[PDB]
Structure formats: C-alpha cells, structure tokens
Symmetry: D2
Subunit: 267 residues, 4 copies
Amino acid sequence: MGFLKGKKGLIVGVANNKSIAYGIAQSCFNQGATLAFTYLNESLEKRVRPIAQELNSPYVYELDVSKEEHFKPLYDSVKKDLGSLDFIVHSVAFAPKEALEGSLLETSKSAFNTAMEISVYSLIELTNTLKPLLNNGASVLTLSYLGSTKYMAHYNVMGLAKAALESAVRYLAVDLGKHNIRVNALSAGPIRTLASSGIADFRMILKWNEINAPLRKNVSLEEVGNAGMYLLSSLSSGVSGEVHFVDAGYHVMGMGAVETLLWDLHK
Amino acid sequence: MGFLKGKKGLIVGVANNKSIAYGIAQSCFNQGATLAFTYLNESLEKRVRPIAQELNSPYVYELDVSKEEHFKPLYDSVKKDLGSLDFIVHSVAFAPKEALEGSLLETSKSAFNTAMEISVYSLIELTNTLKPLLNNGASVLTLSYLGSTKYMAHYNVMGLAKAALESAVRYLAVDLGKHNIRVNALSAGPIRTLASSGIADFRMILKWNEINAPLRKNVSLEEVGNAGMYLLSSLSSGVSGEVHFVDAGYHVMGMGAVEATLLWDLH
Amino acid sequence: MGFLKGKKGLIVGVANNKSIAYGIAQSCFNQGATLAFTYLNESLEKRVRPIAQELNSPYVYELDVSKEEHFKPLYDSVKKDLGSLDFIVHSVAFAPKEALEGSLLETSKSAFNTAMEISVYSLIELTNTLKPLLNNGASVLTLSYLGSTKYMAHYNVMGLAKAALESAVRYLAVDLGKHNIRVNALSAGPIRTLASSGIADFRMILKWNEINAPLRKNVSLEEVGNAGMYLLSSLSSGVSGEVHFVDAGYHVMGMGAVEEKDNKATLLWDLH
Amino acid sequence: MGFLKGKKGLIVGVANNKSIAYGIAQSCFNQGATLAFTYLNESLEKRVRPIAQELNSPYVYELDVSKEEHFKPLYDSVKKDLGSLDFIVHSVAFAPKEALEGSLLETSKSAFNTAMEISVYSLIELTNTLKPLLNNGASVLTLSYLGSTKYMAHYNVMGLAKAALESAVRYLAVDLGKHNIRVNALSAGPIRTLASSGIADFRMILKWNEINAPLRKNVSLEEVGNAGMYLLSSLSSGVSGEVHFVDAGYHVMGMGAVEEATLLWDLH
Ligand SMILES: NC(=O)c1ccc[n+]([C@@H]2O[C@H](COP(=O)([O-])OP(=O)(O)OC[C@H]3O[C@@H](n4cnc5c(N)ncnc54)[C@H](O)[C@@H]3O)[C@@H](O)[C@H]2O)c1
Ligand SMILES: NC(=O)c1ccc[n+]([C@@H]2O[C@H](COP(=O)([O-])OP(=O)(O)OC[C@H]3O[C@@H](n4cnc5c(N)ncnc54)[C@H](O)[C@@H]3O)[C@@H](O)[C@H]2O)c1
Ligand SMILES: NC(=O)c1ccc[n+]([C@@H]2O[C@H](COP(=O)([O-])OP(=O)(O)OC[C@H]3O[C@@H](n4cnc5c(N)ncnc54)[C@H](O)[C@@H]3O)[C@@H](O)[C@H]2O)c1
Ligand SMILES: NC(=O)c1ccc[n+]([C@@H]2O[C@H](COP(=O)([O-])OP(=O)(O)OC[C@H]3O[C@@H](n4cnc5c(N)ncnc54)[C@H](O)[C@@H]3O)[C@@H](O)[C@H]2O)c1
C-alpha cells in the first residue's frame, strides 16, 4: 500500500537526525521509497551514512552545490545506482551569520551572492543536472519560510532568497509541467535544526510561533516530513507550483493572539 | 497503515459519484475511515444511500443547511451512532443560476443572501453544532475555488462567497486551534460535477484550465479526493488555516501559456 | 491643478468629523471636487449637514443602505442636482456588537446576513443604482481592513465581509472597466471612529498597530483621506481592482517588531 | 506649487524619454521637486543630460550599480550639491537577453548573479549609501512586475529577482521606518521602453495585457509616473512596504477575459 513503493528519490540536505531533509526521507522510506543522499563534506558524511543506512540506502554522494564539478558525478552516480528518479528533495540553504544579525541595509554583496547562489540557484542547477533522469509524474520539492513574503525578525537576506526561491518554484512548475513533472515548496514553521542553531536568538522566533500559532504549538519534524512525503507522492499529483504551509497555522495570523495578548500571559 | 483507521468522519455534500465529496469520501474510505453521510433531501437521498452502502456506512442523515431544524437532530444522530467525530467534509455551495450569468452588478439581494448563507454561513453553523463532538486532532475541510481571489468568468457572487469562505477558514482555525482542531480549505480546479454542469461558462473555463495549467491537464476526482484525505488525516497535523490548491498548478499562471504563440491559439 | 477640479462625487458614510468618509471628502474638496453627501437618518443628518456646508456642498440626501426604497430617490436626487458622477466613496459597514466579540463560531445567522448586506451588498446596490450616471473615467472606492485576509483579534464576521468586499472590487472592476470606470479598495489601518468605538477590543488593536508598524505610528485621518483622493483622482487612472494599504506599513509584518541590541532581539511590545 | 515643492529627489534609471524613470521624474517635476539624475555610462549620459535639463536639473552623476567605486562619489556629489534627499527612485534592472529566452532551467550561474546583483542588491547598496542624507519622511521607490508572484512568459530569472526585490522592499520598510522613511514598489503593467523592447516576448505580452485588462488598455507613461509621484510624495505618508499595481487592473485576472462564452482574444 505504501504511496512511494518502487519510487526512487534523491535527498539533498541531511546534516543529522534533526534535518528537515531527514524527516522527509524517513516519511518517504516508511512509504516504500528507494532513497539516495548527498552530503556537503566529510564531517557530515559520517552523519549522513548511518542515517541513509537506517533507511536501507548505501547510495551516498558528495555534493557541495557551490562546486559545479560535483554535479556531473552526481548525475553519473544516480544514473548507475538508481537508473532514474521519481522525486528530488532540495533541502539546502545558507547565508553567513553576520547577514542575519543587524539589518538588511547592512548586507554585503558577497553575503547576498552566497545566500542567493546556495539557497536559490542550487535548485536550478540541481534540477537541470538531473532532469534527463526524471520519470513521468516526478515531483521536485524545496523548502521555504514565511520570511519570503512577510517581514520576520532578521531573516533579512534569506527572506530575499526564499522569495526568489518561491518564484523559481512557479517558473520551474511551468518549465517541467509539460513533462508531467511537479515542483512545490514546503513552507515550514520554525524548527530546531543545525542551521537553526546558527541564527542568534532563534529561540525567540520559535517561542513567538509557539504562543501565537492557531494550534499553540511548534511543528514537529515528523509533521514536516509527512507533508513533504505527501507533496513528493502521487497523492499530490494534482498539486504543482504550490507553497504549502506546515507551520501549525501561524501564517494566518495578522497580529499576536489574544484571550489580553497570549504573549503577555506568557509574560 | 491506513492513515484514517479508527477515524470517524461526516461527509456533507455527496450528490452522485462525480461529487467532490464523493472523491474525498472514497479516498478516506480506502484509508480505513468510518464514514457518515448527509443528504440534501429525499431526491438526493436516493443517490447518497447507495454511495454510503458502497463505502460501508449505515449512517445517512438529512441536512439542508438552510433549515435550522436539521442541525440538532444531526448532532443527536452523530452522537448516538458514532459518539464523536475526527473530521468533517464541508462540500456544499449554491447560487441562483441567473446570478452566475452576466454581471455581479445585477445580483439581487435575495440571491446574494442565498449564496452567502448556503456557501459560507453553513460552515459556521455545521461546525458550531458538531463542535462538542470533535475529538482532539479533528480536521474540518471545506472546498473553495480560485474565483475567490482572482476574477474568473461570470463567477460573480460565488467569488464573493468563496472569498468569505477562505476568511472563515482562517478565523475558525484560530477559534478551534485552542483544542488542537484544524480547519482548512481545498481549492480545486474546475471539474465536471452536477453543480458545475449547471453553469454555461463551465466547458470553456474547464478548457482554459486544461490548455494553460502547468501540467496541461484538468484535475481528476481522485486527485481532489486524495488531497482532501491528506488534509483530513494526521499526515497534515501541522497544517491549518490553509487554502490548498489542487488545480494542476493553474493558480501560478499570470497570463495564457505560450510556446511566441499562445497555446490557446494552437488549439 | 487640483486633481479633482470640476469632478463630481458622492460621499456615502460620513457620521462625524472623525469618519474616514470625512477625511476622504476633505482631501477631495481640497483638490477641487464638487461633493454630495448621504446620511443614515435624521440623527446623523444633524452632523452631516454642517460637514457638507463646511466642504461647500448643499447636496445632502438620506440613504439607509438596508432600505431598497431609498435607492431610486437617491438616483433621482443626484441626477437632478449634479447631472452625473465622476466618483463614489462607499464608506459604510456594520455588524452587531455581539458578533465582533467572542468567536466566529457563535455568530448568529441574522448577524451574519446583516454584516454581509450592510458591508458588502450595499456596494453592489449603490453602484448598480448610480451606474447610469457614472461618467467615462469615473472611480468607485470602498474601504477595507487587513482582517479580510489575515486573522485580526475578534474581527470575526467582519473579516468575512471584508474578504467578500475585496472580491467584489475585483469583479466590479471587470464589469465596469469596459466603460473606463475604475473600482478600488482602500485598506486602512485602525483609526478611532464612531464605529471603532463600539468594539470593546479596539484600543488594544490600535496600540498593537502603533507599536509594531514599520513607521511606529498609527495612520492619521489625513493620510487615509489623501490616499482615497489619490484613488479617486485621475492620477490613479492606471489603477483598478487594487486593495491599497494605508496603514503605516503594518501589512508587511509577519510577527511583532523587535529592537536589535547585542545580536539579541527584544519585542518592542515587551519594552512597552 | 505641488506636493513635492522644495523636495529633493534622486532619479536612478533614466535611459531616454521613454524610461519609466523619466515619466516618474516628469510627474515629480510638475509637483515642484528639485531633481538630480544618474546615468550608466557616457553613452547614456548623452540622453540623461538633456532630460535633466528640460527638468531644470544641473545635477547629473555617473552610477554603474555594478561598480561600487561609484557609490561614495555619488554620496559626495549629492551631499555637496543638494545637502539631503527627500526621495529616491530606483528604476534599474538587467538580465542577459539569453536568460529571458527559453526556460529558467537553462539559466547560467553568471546570468543569475548578474540579474540578482543589478536588479536587487543595487537597491540595498544605493539606499545604504544614501541613508545619512535621507531626511525624515523620505520615500524610496523601486519598480517591479507581476512576474515576481505569477508566471509570466519567459520572464524567468527576472521573476526571481523581482520576487526578491519585493521582499527587500518589505525588510527595508521595517529597517527605515524607525526614521519615518518609507519604501515601496510600483508594479507596472508592460510598457514599451528600451529595456523591454529588447525582449522577443514583449509585443505579445503588451497585446495580451491590453485585451484582457479590466480597463481594456495598456498603461501610459504618465499613468506610471503619476502613481510613482504619489508614492514619493507626502500624499502617501501612511503607505510603506506596498507593492502598488499600475497596470489597468490586469493583476486581478485569473484567466482570459470573456464575452457573451467567448474569449476577447478570439474576437481579436
Ligand atoms: N526553522 C527551520 O529550521 C526551517 C524553517 C523553514 C525552512 N527551512 C529550510 O529547510 C531547509 C533545510 O534546513 P534545515 O532547517 O533542515 O537545517 P539543516 O542544517 O539540517 O539542513 C541544511 C542543509 O544544507 C546543507 N548545505 C549548506 N550549504 C550547502 C552547500 N553548499 N552544498 C550542499 N549542502 C549545503 C547543509 O550541509 C545541511 O545538510 C533549508 O532550505 C531551510 O531554509 C528551515
Ligand atoms: N469545478 C468544480 O466542480 C469545483 C471547483 C472548485 C470548488 N468547488 C466546490 O466544491 C463543492 C462541492 O461541489 P461539487 O462541484 O462537488 O458539486 P456537487 O453538485 O456534486 O455537490 C454540491 C453539493 O451541494 C449540495 N447542496 C446545495 N445546496 C445545499 C443545501 N442548502 N444544503 C445542503 N447541501 C446542499 C448539493 O446537494 C450537492 O450535494 C462546492 O463548495 C463547490 O463550490 C467545485
Ligand atoms: N476605523 C477603522 O479602524 C477602519 C479600518 C479600516 C477600514 N474601515 C472601514 O471604513 C468604513 C467607514 O467606517 P469608519 O471607521 O469611518 O466609521 P464611521 O462610523 O465614522 O463610519 C461608518 C458609517 O457607516 C454608516 N452606516 C452604517 N450602517 C448604515 C446603513 N445601514 N446605511 C447607511 N449608512 C450606514 C454609519 O452611519 C457611518 O456613517 C467602514 O467600511 C469600515 O469598515 C475602518
Ligand atoms: N517596461 C516595462 O514594461 C516594465 C514593467 C514593470 C517594471 N519594469 C521595471 O522598471 C524599471 C526601469 O526599466 P524601464 O522599463 O524603464 O526601462 P529602461 O531601459 O528605460 O530603464 C532601465 C534602466 O536600467 C539601467 N541600468 C541597467 N543596468 C545598469 C547598471 N549596471 N547600472 C546602472 N543602471 C543600469 C539602464 O541604463 C536604464 O536606465 C526596471 O526595474 C524594470 O524591471 C519595467
């Protein structure tokens, strides 16, 4: 019955067992999917390999999206080990920490380029590299955040990146849609991850989300993973170009929640 | 395995085996759901009852949302037969035929009130009635359409209703989030139903969507059904207040698709 | 040079000199418009008449949007007095106080219908009535609020109404655009008006806007008025179907504003 | 005089008398503004200098937004000649012509970086450079297009950049609102300009906009200029972080326009 049985997917972005990419891969594996994984470097490879093993996969490849020379070997590895792809998970972003503190006006050009290149252009290069391998009905998923279309506290240049990323999803949905290939973004609420811990005062965002979200909770890793799996699976074959919020409902809020502000009850 | 096993849901809006509510019920049934169904009147009861039997349900209750007298007996029936509810499908709209022709400027007050009462207020009354029966984690789903937020050919008052409906989803999400209850809308692309076939512009809107959608297809009933099942199941427990597009990607288009010549002109 | 010089407009919704309809009327007058005004009943006429005179207008008519029988005489009055109309300001809404407290869940059916009829269908009926008087190039403006598309504390049924109202703006802009007639919505931040005062939830929403808005201020009546005059004047003749925020930037905010110090965030609300 | 009398404004992006920046400048001048202008290179200075002069401006500075050595000179030139600024017009974009052909999937990394740097980061660098000269109540305006949030044919990386640009408008509005400074985007419908004419797809996008827009017309240069002038003036002092559509209503359409059950384009 598994909704990805016999389906083959590449997972780009696992860092540890907290990675959103890991939550999605786990839900996919529980639905019968055959998986491959990339790692950025040798230190992360020692985390990615045991994770890939718990999901029955020896297919682990190096990929620094900033290094163009890594893409043709990736294509060769996937083609040799999997033959073709039913889905890709693009779960990678980076902006230097100093660009996320302070203000947007204060962003350097190289911080701007790095954020755009790693968080946005990497989806274009990854999908173009792997496009010949994509089967009929395949699904490409990337990860985004409400900071793209609303101000969120000192997301700054990443908000610009995620806005361009969501636009990319719409143009790629059209480019690939004539090949019966879907492209979507999962917009997750804040969640504790390796990249999360690199943002100063991230716990304030997580706490503000928890108190003010309709469901009065932060989202779990498994909730993000299950939504990803849905978008990657044929259940969502009528869905493309979509930005899907998995955020405990936080996106509907136009102001702080009340009862007196819930935030003030929290004191 | 079934993502609705042991879960009890009320299906409001089956008219025949082409109804959106039927597609959703069918997917929910295949995921192990215990279902109950309502019927508008005795004429529609003749088609709802065989569909309910097909989906293993002896629970068939009367509901004309315009008749307040039906709501408390519906409550009694559900509590006595099922005890509680884990999800509610609200798949009901109506506007006078003449209102969806011509222009919005010509809409009578009575036709405006009918569209709003049947298509929007009914969600409030249905949810408030059944709220004491809603289990922790329950999911309320309504059905909407892109004409709520963009102009669609002669949608008129129903675009006003659908806009109000999506706003109701947001406020209800906040209202019920307190109790870990989710409220969402599935925004389907055009699909041939009994109600949709009652519009003169439908064939052409259906054809416009087919040619110009990224996936170059109209959505299937099973595709709408599965996305609905997903929003009703715990797989989407991090999702609330969402307007979820199941429209073959059509929502992203800002103009006719091209190839420069319009794809429309080639056909 | 007055951007509305020689243009004739009808202002629906003045209740006193704090009304959004008055701020808009005043900026229109200052841009040279010839104005007429409506009033809900004789009580409100006592305030509308001196305002009308203040803005150089002797054309003051009764209009309760819930009474169909008022609309043809309104059409006849305007036709007889002004001949034709270059703009309309629809600045009218109502919901029973009950409904703007507590949850949307407990909204009665009568309160829902009242809210929808007064706040939304009135724009359809008003525009349909006056439509044969509208000149080429005319501009129709209604007022909305962010509670249409985002949750705002206890706005409830009025959020549903404003959502449908913004949708009506899009449909009417298509219907009327064939005649070079424009239809827009001005979405204002909170501001104290007679109708604001009825909501017991309001001083807090105002203060939350003031603290958290990009410009760290509530909008003034003059700023709402000037934006409206813009949308009503030919300066905005390329603009139709728009929901235009005049709210000190509040609409962009995904969360409370913060003060940044030593790489650490403190919500401005918490310093407040 | 008008709603910009005594107000000092920098206009970045005039290419000729068809430029959006020109139409906005012209409207601002008719409202009594003191104007100053930038040009890309000597070729473009040949048309910016006469235009600045018909708008009574002796202040004409070089600014290639890809050369950061130009930016403190610009700061110095402005500080000396005008002392301060009440508004800035950022009317600049570029992507390699190949990148607006075909598909987004074939976009090269250099093409992507050029588009992002010219079209987006330049707003950040220009505003940060000029921030100490901005007076209370100043207004910063940039230009966007519906391709940011909707698919438009072959708009490709410019869609990604305009999406990032509108996000930047929101963050800059928060950053600068502390000092009562406003930041907005004007989202114009298609209009024939020097940059736009060099796209194969444009004529058809114009004609599609004209047939299907609620107002059944394309927008004029003066309509875009007047809306820009409004956003730059005290008339809009309650408006910040806004994406303001000046497109004859086109943005509202969810499909082609029809008529009693036939597409207007088919009658065309
Ligand atoms: N609160 C949140 O954590 C949250 C919410 C919204 C969206 N997201 C998005 O989720 C995605 C994954 O992040 P995460 O939160 O799971 O954190 P994470 O740290 O687990 O994952 C980030 C991954 O990006 C990889 N990466 C960085 N630079 C790379 C490069 N040059 N080449 C290859 N890989 C590179 C890292 O190695 C890591 O595997 C991102 O796109 C992120 O913006 C995060
Ligand atoms: N193209 C489409 O068909 C489409 C697209 C988007 C969304 N929708 C929405 O989907 C929902 C279901 O419609 P459908 O297309 O499946 O058509 P349908 O005719 O199969 O179902 C509509 C149902 O509404 C019921 N109904 C009408 N008035 C009622 C009342 N007063 N009380 C109770 N039930 C009442 C009808 O009996 C019928 O069962 C509606 O909200 C519709 O707007 C339809
Ligand atoms: N004040 C705010 O915070 C705010 C914010 C955004 C938008 N709005 C909108 O602005 C508009 C004007 O409200 P306001 O704040 O200026 O308050 P107000 O009380 O000054 O104006 C409301 C007007 O509606 C009129 N009205 C009510 N029922 C009527 C009926 N049946 N027939 C005719 N007229 C009727 C009242 O008599 C009054 O003149 C409303 O549409 C409101 O929703 C207000
Ligand atoms: N023309 C349209 O239909 C349309 C629609 C919406 C928005 N836009 C936006 O309007 C703005 C202005 O474009 P336009 O249509 O007036 O065309 P235009 O060709 O007249 O103006 C483009 C300007 O950008 C300048 N520019 C390019 N690269 C530069 C660089 N490296 N440094 C400095 N200046 C540089 C050009 O020299 C020129 O002055 C752009 O942001 C554009 O994307 C245009």
